[PDB]
Design a protein that fits this description.
Chains B, C: It is found in: Virion. 3 copies of one chain form a homotrimer. Chain A is an alpha+beta fold. Chain A has 3 domains: 1-38, Single alpha-helices involved in coiled-coils or other helix-helix interfaces (Up-down Bundle), CATH 1.20.5; 39-78, Ribbon (Laminin); 79-210, Adenovirus Type 5 Fiber Protein (Receptor Binding Domain). Chain A contains 2 helices and 14 strands, in the order αββββββββββαββββ. In chain A, the strands form 3 sheets. Chain A has an 8-stranded antiparallel β-barrel. In chain A, strands 2-3 form a two-stranded antiparallel ribbon. A two-stranded antiparallel ribbon of chain A has the order 4-5. In chain A, a hairpin with a 2-residue loop joins strand 2 (50-53) and strand 3. At the A-C interface, helix 1, strand 1 and helix 2 of A face helix 1, strand 3, strand 4, strand 5 and strand 7 of C. The structure holds chloride ion (2 copies) and zinc ion (7 copies).
């Protein structure tokens, strides 16, 4: 009986020792888990144009502007040469309309217009305004987005080159256009004289950022 | 019996350890669920030694804190290029070419002092990179992008014919990455000679 | 013997706790190895309060879900620039300048007021920002990028001399970030006056 009690006491002391070892290991774990819980990269999110899908972070790229070939580079979208007819509308120095043959070269988010006319435009003053509304294109191109300027571009007048024949002589002017809305721009240019007169063989060259 | 008290005390400590273990298990299971553990990066994003970068083509873009336009130096290349009549001419003509490369835009300004014999009212004139002998060091600035190659593109031409100037808004098209052909009116019909050909155009590379 | 049973029971629970601890140590070691810990982000990527962004120059690019071209408003600046003859002229000439700033491109359309006295067959004409009257607020739009400044660039010029028009494909080059000089033929020799000078060029900013 004395040996029972004394032996059990030694066993208890050994158990105490094990419990303290577990106690210490618990504290080390608690410190380690506290440290892990403070990890800065935990909870990261990504704002457009960055995005995550199934743990893969990507840069979302507009193919008319940029692409990747390992590094971020310029546009991958195919260029187009659009060909259509556009009835331009004279105002402010003309009441007439003129049918323009238009080639629109769309490359990246730049669209360059090259236009020439058949027929003529009667003018009454030394300056005329000519309006280009997308609704007046004879057979609207499918890719309409390429003919609409960006919000940034729309905010300013932009240069337009014009040439035409008046009294069997060709005149040419550095002129300007401006968008009155996303679908409509108007150009203003000298007519090469005063009074009622006719100009023909009108060419318009300009370009826009889309 | 003194032993019984010691046993009762040990039980309480074991139970305390158990509770702390359960708390740790819950916290570690929470840590294992952390959404950011699974993260990788797709080009043009890349990671090296824990640093995540945007890899940038210096001909297109750069950083000055924010992502901005190209840092690559522009170049004004000057060289001669033999162009080849390929329809409406079987003649050739040596062009003096200035190529202004700025970012991924390359603008051509060409002129000639020679003569081109043409046989019809339209001529096709071909520009193959192989016909540049004194090549510049960055020949990739003369190669259009895949996207740009997909369409015809505007070319202005001017020349003299029978002592008269002619100028036309004309078009070119790449038949391959190294070759484009311009198509333009010759200013008349039959066999004739045109002089002082100027060509102005540009490409996106 | 009774406390012997109780000691066996305590032993079993202590053992269970130790094994639970070993498993937690393995899981925590694994968590400590997590590759995504300590990720950082290099310009133009940045992080603020755990949100990772692409910092975008609004004159170059923007996002509309995807990374796209500039959002900044275009501007048509109008000002007077007094250009200075720096070879083949010691004269000055006042230019009316429209600068069309769209994204990081600035296109100049200039027309002259008055006559420029030239002395030779080529003139150099200098455009220093200090000579602009009523300097725009966004002066940054008139300063070429470091990349652009590295090369000469095309400039179109036209003017009148002795009642005849002349027009040349010419070139300019920046001597410093604030100053460029254009070089062009004057259409003759000796002392003369040219008028109605127009200049058209563009720069990447
Ligand atoms: Cl006992
Ligand atoms: Cl324990
Ligand atoms: Zn006129
Ligand atoms: Zn973690
Ligand atoms: Zn002709
Ligand atoms: Zn138990
Ligand atoms: Zn286990
Ligand atoms: Zn003077
Ligand atoms: Zn001349």
């Amino acid at each position: 009986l004395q040996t029972t009690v004394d032996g059990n006491s030694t066993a208890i002391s050994n158990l105490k020792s094990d419990i303290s070892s577990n106690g210490l290991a618990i504290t080390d774990l608690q410190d380690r888990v506290k440290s892990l819980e403070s990890t800065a990269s935990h909870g990261l999110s990504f704002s457009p144009p960055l995005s995550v899908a199934d743990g893969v972070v990507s840069l979302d790229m507009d193919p008319y502007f940029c692409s990747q070939r390992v590094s971020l580079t310029s546009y991958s979208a195919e260029a187009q040469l659009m060909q259509f007819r556009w009835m331009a509308r004279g105002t402010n120095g003309s009441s007439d309309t003129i049918d323009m043959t238009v080639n629109a070269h769309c490359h990246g988010r730049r669209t360059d217009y090259m236009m020439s006319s058949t027929g003529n435009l009667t003018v009454t003053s030394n300056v005329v305004l000519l309006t280009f509304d997308l609704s007046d294109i004879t057979h609207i191109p499918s890719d309409l987005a390429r003919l609409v300027p960006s919000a940034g571009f729309q905010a300013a007048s932009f240069p337009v080159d014009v040439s035409f024949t008046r009294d069997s002589a060709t005149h040419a002017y550095q002129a300007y256009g401006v968008y009155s809305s996303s679908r409509v721009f108007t150009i203003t240019f000298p007519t090469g004289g005063d009074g009622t007169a006719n100009i023909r063989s009108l060419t318009v060259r300009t370009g826009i950022d889309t």
